[PDB]
mmCIF file of N, CA, C and O in Angstrom:
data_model
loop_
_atom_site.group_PDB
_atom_site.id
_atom_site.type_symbol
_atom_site.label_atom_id
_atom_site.label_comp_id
_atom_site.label_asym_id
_atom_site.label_seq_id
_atom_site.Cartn_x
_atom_site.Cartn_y
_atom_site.Cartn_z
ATOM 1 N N UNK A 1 2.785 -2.275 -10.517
ATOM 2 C CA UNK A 1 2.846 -2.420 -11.976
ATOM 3 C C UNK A 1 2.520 -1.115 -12.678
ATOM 4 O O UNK A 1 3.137 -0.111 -12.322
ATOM 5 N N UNK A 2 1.638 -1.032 -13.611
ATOM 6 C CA UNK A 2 1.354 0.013 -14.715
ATOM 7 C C UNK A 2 0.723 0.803 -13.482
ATOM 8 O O UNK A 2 1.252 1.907 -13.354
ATOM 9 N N UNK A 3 -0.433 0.483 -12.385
ATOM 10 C CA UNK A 3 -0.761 1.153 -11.465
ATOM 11 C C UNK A 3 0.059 1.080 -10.098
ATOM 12 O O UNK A 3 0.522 -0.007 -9.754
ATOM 13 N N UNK A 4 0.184 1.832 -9.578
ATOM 14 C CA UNK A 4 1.183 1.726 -8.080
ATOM 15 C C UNK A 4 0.144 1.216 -7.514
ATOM 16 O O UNK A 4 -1.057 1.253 -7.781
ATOM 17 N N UNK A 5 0.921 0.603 -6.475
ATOM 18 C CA UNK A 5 0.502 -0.224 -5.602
ATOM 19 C C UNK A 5 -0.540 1.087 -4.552
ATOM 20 O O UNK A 5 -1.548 1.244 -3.863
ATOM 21 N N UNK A 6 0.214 1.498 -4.912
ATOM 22 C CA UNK A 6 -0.362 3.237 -3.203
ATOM 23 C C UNK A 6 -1.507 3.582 -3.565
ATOM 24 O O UNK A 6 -2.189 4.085 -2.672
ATOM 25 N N UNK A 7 -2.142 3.459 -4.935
ATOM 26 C CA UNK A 7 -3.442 3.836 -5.373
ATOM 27 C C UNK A 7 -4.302 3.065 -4.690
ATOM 28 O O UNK A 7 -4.602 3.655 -3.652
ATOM 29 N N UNK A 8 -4.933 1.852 -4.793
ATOM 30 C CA UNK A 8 -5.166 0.782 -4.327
ATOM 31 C C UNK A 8 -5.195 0.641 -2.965
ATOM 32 O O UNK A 8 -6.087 -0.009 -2.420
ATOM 33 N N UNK A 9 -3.902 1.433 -2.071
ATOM 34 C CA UNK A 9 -4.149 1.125 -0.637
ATOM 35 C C UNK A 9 -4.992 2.793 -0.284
ATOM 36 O O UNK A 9 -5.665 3.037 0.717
ATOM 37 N N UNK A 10 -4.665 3.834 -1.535
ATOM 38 C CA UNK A 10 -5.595 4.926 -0.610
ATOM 39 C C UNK A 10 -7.025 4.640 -1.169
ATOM 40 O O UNK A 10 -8.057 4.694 -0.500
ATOM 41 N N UNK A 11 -6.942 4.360 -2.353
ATOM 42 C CA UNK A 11 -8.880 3.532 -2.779
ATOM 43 C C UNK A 11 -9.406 2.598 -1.518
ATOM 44 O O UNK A 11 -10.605 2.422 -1.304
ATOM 45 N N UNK A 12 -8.433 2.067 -0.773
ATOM 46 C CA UNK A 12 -9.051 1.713 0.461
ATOM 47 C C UNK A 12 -9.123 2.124 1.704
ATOM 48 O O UNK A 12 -9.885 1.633 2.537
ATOM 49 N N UNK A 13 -8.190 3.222 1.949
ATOM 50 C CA UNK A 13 -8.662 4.581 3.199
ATOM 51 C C UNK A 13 -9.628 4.881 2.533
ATOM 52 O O UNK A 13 -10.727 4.391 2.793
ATOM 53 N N UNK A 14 -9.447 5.775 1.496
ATOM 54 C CA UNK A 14 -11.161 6.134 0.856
ATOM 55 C C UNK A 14 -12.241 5.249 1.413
ATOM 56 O O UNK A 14 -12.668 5.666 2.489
ATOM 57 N N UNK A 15 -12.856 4.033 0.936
ATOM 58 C CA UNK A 15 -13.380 3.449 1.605
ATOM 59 C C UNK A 15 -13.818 3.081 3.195
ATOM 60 O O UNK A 15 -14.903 2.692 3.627
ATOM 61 N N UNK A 16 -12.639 3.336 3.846
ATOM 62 C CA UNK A 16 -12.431 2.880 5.321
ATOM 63 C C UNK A 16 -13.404 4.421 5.718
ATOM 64 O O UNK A 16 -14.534 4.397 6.205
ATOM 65 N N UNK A 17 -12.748 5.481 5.418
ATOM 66 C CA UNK A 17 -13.043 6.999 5.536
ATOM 67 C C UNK A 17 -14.602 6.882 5.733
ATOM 68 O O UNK A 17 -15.078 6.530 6.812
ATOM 69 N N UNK A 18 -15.502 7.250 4.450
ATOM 70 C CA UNK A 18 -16.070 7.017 4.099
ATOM 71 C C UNK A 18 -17.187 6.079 5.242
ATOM 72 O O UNK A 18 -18.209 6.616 5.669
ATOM 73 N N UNK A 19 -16.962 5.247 5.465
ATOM 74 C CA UNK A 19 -17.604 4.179 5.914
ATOM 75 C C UNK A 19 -17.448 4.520 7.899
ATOM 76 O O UNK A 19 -18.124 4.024 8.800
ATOM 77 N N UNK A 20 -16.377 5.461 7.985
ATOM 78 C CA UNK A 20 -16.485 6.089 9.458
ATOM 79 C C UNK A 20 -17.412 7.319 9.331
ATOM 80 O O UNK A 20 -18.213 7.681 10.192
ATOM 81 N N UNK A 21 -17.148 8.027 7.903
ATOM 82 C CA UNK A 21 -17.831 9.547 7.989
ATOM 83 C C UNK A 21 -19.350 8.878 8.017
ATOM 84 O O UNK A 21 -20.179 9.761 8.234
ATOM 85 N N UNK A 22 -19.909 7.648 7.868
ATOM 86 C CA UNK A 22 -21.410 7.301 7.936
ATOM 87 C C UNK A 22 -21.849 6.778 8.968
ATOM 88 O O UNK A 22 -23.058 6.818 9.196
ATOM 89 N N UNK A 23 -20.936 6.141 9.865
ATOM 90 C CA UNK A 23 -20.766 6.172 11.393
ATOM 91 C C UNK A 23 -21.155 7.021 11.987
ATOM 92 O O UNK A 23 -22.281 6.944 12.479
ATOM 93 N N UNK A 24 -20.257 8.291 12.180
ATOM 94 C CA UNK A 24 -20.351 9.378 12.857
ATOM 95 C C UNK A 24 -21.671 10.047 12.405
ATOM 96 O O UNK A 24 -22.140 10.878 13.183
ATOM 97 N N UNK A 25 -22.249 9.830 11.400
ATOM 98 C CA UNK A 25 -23.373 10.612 10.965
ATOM 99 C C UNK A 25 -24.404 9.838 11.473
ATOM 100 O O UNK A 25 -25.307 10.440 12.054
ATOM 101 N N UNK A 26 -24.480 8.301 11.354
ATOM 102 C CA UNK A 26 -25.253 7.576 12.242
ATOM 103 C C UNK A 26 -25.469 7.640 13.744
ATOM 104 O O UNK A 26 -25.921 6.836 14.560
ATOM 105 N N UNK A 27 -24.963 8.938 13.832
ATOM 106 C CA UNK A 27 -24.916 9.534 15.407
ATOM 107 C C UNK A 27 -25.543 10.297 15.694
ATOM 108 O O UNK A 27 -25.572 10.454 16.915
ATOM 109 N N UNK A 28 -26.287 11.099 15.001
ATOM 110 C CA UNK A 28 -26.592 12.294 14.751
ATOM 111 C C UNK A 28 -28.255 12.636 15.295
ATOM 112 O O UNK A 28 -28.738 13.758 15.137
ATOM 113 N N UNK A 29 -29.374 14.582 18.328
ATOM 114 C CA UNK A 29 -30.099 14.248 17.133
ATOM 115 C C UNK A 29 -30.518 16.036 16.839
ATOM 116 O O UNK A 29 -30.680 16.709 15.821
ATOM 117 N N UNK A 30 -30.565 16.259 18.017
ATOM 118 C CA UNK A 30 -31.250 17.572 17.574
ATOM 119 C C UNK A 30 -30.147 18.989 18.055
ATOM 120 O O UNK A 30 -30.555 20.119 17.788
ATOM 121 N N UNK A 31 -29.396 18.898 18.440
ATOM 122 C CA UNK A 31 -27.973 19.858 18.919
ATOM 123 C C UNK A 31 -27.093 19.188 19.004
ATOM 124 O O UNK A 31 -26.385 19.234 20.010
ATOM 125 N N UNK A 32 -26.804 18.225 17.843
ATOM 126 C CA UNK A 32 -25.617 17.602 18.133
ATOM 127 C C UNK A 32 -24.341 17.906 18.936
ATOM 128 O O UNK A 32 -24.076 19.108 18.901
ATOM 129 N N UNK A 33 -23.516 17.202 19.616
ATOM 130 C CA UNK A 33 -21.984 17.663 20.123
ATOM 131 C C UNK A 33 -21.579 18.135 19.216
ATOM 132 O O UNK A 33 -21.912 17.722 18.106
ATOM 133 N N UNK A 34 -20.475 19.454 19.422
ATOM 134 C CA UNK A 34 -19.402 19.725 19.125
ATOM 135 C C UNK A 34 -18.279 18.872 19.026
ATOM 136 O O UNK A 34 -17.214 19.458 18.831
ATOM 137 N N UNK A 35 -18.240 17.605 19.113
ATOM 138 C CA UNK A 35 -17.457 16.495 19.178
ATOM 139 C C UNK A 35 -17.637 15.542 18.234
ATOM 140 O O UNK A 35 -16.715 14.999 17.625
ATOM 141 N N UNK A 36 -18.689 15.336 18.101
ATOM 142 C CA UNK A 36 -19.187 14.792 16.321
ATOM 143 C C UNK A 36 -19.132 15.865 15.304
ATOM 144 O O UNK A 36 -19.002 15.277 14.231
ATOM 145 N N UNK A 37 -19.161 16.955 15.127
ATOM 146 C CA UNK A 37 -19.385 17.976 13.936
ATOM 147 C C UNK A 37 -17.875 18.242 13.815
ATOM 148 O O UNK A 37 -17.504 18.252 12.642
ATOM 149 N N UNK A 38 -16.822 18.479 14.804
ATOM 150 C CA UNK A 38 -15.853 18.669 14.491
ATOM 151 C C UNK A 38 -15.184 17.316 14.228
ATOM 152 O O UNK A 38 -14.007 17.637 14.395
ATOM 153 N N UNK A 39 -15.172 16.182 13.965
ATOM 154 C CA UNK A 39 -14.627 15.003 13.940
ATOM 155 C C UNK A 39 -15.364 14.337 12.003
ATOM 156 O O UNK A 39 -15.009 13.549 11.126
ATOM 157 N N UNK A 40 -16.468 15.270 12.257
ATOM 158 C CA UNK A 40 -17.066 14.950 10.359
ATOM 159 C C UNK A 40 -16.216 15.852 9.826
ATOM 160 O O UNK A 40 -15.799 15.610 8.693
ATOM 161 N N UNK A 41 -15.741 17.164 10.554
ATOM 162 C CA UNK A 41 -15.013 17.939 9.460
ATOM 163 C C UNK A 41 -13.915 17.480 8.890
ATOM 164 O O UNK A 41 -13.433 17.640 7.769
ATOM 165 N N UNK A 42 -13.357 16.458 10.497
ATOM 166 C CA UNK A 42 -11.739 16.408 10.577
ATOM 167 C C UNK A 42 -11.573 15.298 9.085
ATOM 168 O O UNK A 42 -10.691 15.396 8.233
ATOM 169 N N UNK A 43 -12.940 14.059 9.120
ATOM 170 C CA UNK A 43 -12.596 12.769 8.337
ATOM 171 C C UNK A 43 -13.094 13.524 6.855
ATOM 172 O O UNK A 43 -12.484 13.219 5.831
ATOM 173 N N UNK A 44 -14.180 14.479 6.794
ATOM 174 C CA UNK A 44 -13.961 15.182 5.605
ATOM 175 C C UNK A 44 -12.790 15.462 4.880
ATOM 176 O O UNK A 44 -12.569 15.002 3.759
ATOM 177 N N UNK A 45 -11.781 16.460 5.706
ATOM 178 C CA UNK A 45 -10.565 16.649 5.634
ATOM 179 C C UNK A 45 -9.944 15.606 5.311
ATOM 180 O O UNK A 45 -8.999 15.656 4.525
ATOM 181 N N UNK A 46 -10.220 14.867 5.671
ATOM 182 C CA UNK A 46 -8.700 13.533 5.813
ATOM 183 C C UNK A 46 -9.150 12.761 4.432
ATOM 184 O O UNK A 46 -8.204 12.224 3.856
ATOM 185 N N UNK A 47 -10.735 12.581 3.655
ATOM 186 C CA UNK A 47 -11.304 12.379 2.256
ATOM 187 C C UNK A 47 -10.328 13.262 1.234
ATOM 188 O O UNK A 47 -9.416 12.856 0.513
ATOM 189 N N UNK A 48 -10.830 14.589 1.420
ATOM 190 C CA UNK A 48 -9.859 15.494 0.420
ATOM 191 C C UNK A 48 -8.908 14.903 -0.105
ATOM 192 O O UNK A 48 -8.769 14.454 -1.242
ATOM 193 N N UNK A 49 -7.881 14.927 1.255
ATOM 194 C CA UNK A 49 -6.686 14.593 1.324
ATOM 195 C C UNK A 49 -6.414 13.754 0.324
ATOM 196 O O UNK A 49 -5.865 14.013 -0.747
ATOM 197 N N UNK A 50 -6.910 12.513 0.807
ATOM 198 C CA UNK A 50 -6.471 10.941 -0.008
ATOM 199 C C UNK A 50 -6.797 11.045 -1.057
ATOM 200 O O UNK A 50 -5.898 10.570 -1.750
ATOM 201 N N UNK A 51 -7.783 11.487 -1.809
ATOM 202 C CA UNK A 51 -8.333 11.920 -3.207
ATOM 203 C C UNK A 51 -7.407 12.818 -3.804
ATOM 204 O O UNK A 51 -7.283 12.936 -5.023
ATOM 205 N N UNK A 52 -6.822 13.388 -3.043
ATOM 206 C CA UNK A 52 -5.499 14.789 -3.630
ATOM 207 C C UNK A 52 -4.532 13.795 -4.200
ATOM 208 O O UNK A 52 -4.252 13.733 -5.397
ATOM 209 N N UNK A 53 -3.900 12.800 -2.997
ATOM 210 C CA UNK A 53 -2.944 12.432 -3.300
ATOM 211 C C UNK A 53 -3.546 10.637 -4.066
ATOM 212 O O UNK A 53 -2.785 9.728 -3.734
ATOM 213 N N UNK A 54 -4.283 10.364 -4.620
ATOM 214 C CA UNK A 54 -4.912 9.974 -5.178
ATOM 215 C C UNK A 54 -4.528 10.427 -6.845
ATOM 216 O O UNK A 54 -3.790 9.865 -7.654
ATOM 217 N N UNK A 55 -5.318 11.617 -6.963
ATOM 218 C CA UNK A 55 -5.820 12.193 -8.240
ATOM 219 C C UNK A 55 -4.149 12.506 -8.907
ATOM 220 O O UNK A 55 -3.874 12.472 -10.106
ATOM 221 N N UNK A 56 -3.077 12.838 -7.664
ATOM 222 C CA UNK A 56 -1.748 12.847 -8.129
ATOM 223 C C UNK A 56 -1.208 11.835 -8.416
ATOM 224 O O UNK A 56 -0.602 11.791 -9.487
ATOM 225 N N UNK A 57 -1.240 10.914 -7.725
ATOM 226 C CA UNK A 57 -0.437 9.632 -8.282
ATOM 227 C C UNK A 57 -1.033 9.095 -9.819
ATOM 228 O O UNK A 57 -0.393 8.310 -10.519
ATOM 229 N N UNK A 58 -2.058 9.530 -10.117
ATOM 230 C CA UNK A 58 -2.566 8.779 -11.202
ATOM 231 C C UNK A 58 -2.093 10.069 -12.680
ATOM 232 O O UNK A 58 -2.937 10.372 -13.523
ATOM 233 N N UNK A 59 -0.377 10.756 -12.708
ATOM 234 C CA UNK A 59 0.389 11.325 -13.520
ATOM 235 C C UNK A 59 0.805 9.828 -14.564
ATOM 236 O O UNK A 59 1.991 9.717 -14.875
ATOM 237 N N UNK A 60 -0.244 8.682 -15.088
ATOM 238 C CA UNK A 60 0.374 7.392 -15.731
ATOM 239 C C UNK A 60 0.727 8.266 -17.038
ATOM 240 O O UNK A 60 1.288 7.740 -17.999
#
């Protein structure tokens, strides 16, 4: 409708995201892996993202 539907499904990757990046941090103790720090960067990254194309779709 007045809002696309695609907003709504990335407001819920956002969420999903989000709710893994607190996962992975719930991992966390004193030299963490290189396997968790690069995997917070990656879902960091992948936040940006959806917020990019997010903040674009919302041209109403």
């Amino acid at each position: 409708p007045a809002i696309p539907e695609e907003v709504w499904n990335i407001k819920q990757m956002i969420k999903l995201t989000q709710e893994h990046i607190e996962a992975l941090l719930d991992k966390f103790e004193h030299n963490p892996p290189s396997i968790y720090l690069e995997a917070y960067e990656e879902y960091t990254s992948k936040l940006d993202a959806l917020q990019q194309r997010e903040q674009q779709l919302l041209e109403s």
